[model samples]
Target: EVWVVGMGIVMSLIVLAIVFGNVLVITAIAKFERLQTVTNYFITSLACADLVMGLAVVPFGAAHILTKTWTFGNFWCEFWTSIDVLCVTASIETLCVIAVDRYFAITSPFKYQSLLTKNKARVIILMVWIVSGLTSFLPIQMHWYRATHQEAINCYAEETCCDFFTNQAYAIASSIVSFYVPLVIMVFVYSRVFQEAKRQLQKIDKSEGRFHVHKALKTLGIIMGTFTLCWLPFFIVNIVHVIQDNLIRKEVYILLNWIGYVNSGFNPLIYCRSPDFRIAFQELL
Candidate 1:
């Protein structure tokens, strides 16, 4: 009873936070002309995806996990898994897209505007959604992996679960594509972008370089750290589940997974750390 009550409150808060936070993000970018740009629209696209997950995906998941019943049967199982994969993959892809956008802005400030157009951003987002569908729902429906499942009612089914990725290769591949690859790209891009910024600052003067370095480290540093912190544990645990099977502790998995969900609430705020974002948010309020 206490467990149910605790989960109910926490899940409610998480869902509300993600929904309201992302709505604010979408509105801020779309509502205000000042913040509207192709660059930020990538972020807007991300927030949109997160909002969908908050409303449609997280609630069902919370109910399923908290009740300790896989009551949804085959259709619900497939549906939830599909949307979960879609949103999770899209989030990773969007983060990478954002990192690349920042890379362009930092390394080639003048050409960034000319090179990345609104149409381009739209195309990229469209591709991400389509790809997410293909990787998740399409493949599952088709039985893309050389695998089988002995379905049951509970999620942690050596018996009672929805579907299983019997193919370790496919599991590994999906994990890489979804999280690891994107993370490496982001880390590499940030490192290079920071180096370039430091170089530019150095040419101006040591004091100027230090000042800029302090600012960048303060903002981007924390943002990057938070992103990594929230996500890394879940991904690592997921990988372990894939490989070692039965090694996972159920409660720990649930905690790490929800920790990742909480990141959606923080992302938009973390993103708009500039003076402009705050003022625009004020105006919006």
Candidate 2:
């Protein structure tokens, strides 16, 4: 009873935190003209994705955690898994898009204005959602994993805690595409950004250039740092399981996955650290 009630309260707060933080980001961008731009649109898009995570995904997930089982039966389990993939992938995709936009913003200041047009931004966002939804839903949601070369395994039954990760091909594919690929993309994209910025910084006074390089590197670390810290545990456990290696406790898996959810909660929290965002937030409040 204590665990149930305590988890309920904690989940309630997490729901509120994700919703409230992302809403503030979306609202601030919409409200302030200074914050309006194609890049900000991408930020808005990512926040929208996080908002959906809070709204569509969290309640069911919270209940599942409390029960320590998939109480909603088979269809709901598949539905829940699909929704989780869709929202989580969309956020990752949007984060990559935002990174690219930020890369161009820092590297190509003049062209940045003309490069990311509103029409292009909308198209990019549309593609992100459609691709994320189809990739997750088609393979996992409809039992399509069984159609693959690997034999089927038990998943999403009332007795189980996790759905359909046992198929070898599906397991590897999901791990590579869902987690590792995005992780690499963010790191590589931002690394190039700092490199280009470093070159530009060096063209100025040598000392000033060095200082700027250090600053950009710090920014890169913060972005990559929070991301890795939140996700590495989840991926480590899942990947080890995929390889048919030693598995951690189920409760540990649950807790680590919750830590991954912390990334979404911190999405807006990270942005809020920006001086501009902070000032805008104060004004918005």
Candidate 3:
């Protein structure tokens, strides 16, 4: 009883943290005009995705982890997985979009404004959501993600708990789209960003661009580093589970999943570290 209660409290706190942090980001973006930039728009989109994860996905996940069974049954189980896939896909893709946008801004300041207008940014955000939804619901609903490529007949027939499982094809596809591709894109783009910043720092005489590049690189490091740390373990375990189904322990899988869930909370915390967001948060409070 004590262990259950303790775990419940900890899980509930994570849920609350995700909800609270993402809400602050969304709210600050909507309310403040200064927070309204093209990049901020992408950040808002990312926060919205994370908000859905906190509100729609994490509570059910928390219950599943704590109870060790999906009491809500099979259909809801699929819904949980699909929603999580959609949100997580959107989150990472938006990060990639943001990274690219930052790269363009730092590298080509003269064209950045006209190149990524607010209207164009909205269209890009729409496309991200569209792809995410399609990737998540299409294969999962059609049973293409299943090992047998058919329905289980009955979820409880074999006394197995309801959980998300994917065939090798879908596992490779989804992981590549949602995690690996985005990870690679961010890493590559940020390396260019670092190089560009270093070049600018060395060439320029004044400290104006120097300070801006310094802060931008610092923020970029934290953002990329946090994302890799949070999701890498889960994705590694995910692929290993596909290849060697028995290798991952149940508890280890559960822990890694919760680590991924905790990532949604980290973005807003990272955002608040920015001076503009810090002032907005203080003013709002």
Candidate 4:
């Protein structure tokens, strides 16, 4: 009983934190004119995705955690998974896009303004959503999932959602597109941005103007750092599952799964507490 109560408390706190933090981000950007820029627009979209996941996905997930099974039925099983995939992928893509934008701004300042305009950013954001939606929905709708064995206790444990163990192709595809590709893009873009920022900082003398630039670089670094920490374990677990020939230990898998879910809650908290982001959030409040 005490364990259950503790889980409930932890779950509630995580939900509240994500909801309030993301709301603060949106409100901050919306109320402050200075925050209204192409970059903030993308950040807002990322926040929106996290917000949706918090509001829609987390509640159902919480219930499942308590019950240890999905009682939501077949249609909802697919729907929730679709939303989960779409929003999560979109969030990662938004981060990648931000990295690219930052790289351009730092490496090619002369062309940055014209090259990465609000219009282009909007188009890319739109594409991110559309592409993510299609990719997430199509596989499930097309029956890419399959039941491995009717006798197996875990094989259709919920009788609604398809298990990845039954569908190797779907599992492999999801791992590649949803995890690996985005990870590669984020690492590449951020590395370039870091190198360029270092070069620019070396050329500038210590002054108030340079201070602003330093703050921006620090903010970007914090964002990238948090992202890497949050997703790396999740990706590692996925890769482990792919290579393992034997059955995965239930305890380990459960731990890793929740770790990934915990990532969902971390982004908002990180943004709220970050020195650079706090001022913006305060303005929104």
Error of 4 at 18 (Å): 0.6
Model 3, residue 26: what's the lDDT? 83
Please state the error at residue 5 of candidate 1 in Å.
Answer: 1.1
Residue-wise lDDT of candidate 2 within 133-186, one digit each (tens)?
788899875576653323234343335555444556776677676778778877
- Candidate No. with top lDDT: 3
What are the RMSD figures for all models against the true structure?
3.4, 3.8, 3.4, 4.1
- Which rank order by TM-score, best down to worst? 3, 1, 2, 4
lDDT of each: 0.79, 0.77, 0.82, 0.72
> Comparing candidate 1 with candidate 4, which one achieves the higher TM-score?
1
Candidate 2 minimal-lDDT segment of 10 residues: 148-157
Give residue 140's error in model 1 in angstroms.
Answer: 1.6
Instruction: Give the TM-score of each candidate.
Output: 0.87, 0.84, 0.89, 0.83
- What is the C-alpha local distance difference test score of candidate 3? 0.82
Q: Work out candidate 2's RMSD over C-alphas.
A: 3.8
Can you write out model 3's per-residue Cα lDDT over 13-64, one digit (the tens) per residue?
Answer: 9888888888878888899999887778888888889889999988887777
Better of 2 and 4 by lDDT: 2
| Tens-digit lDDT track of model 4 for 184-221 | 87778777777766766766745446466577578766
Best by TM-score: 3
lDDT (tens digit, per residue) of candidate 1 on 83-170: 8888988987998988988888878878978898978888988998788778888776665654544432233343335433546766
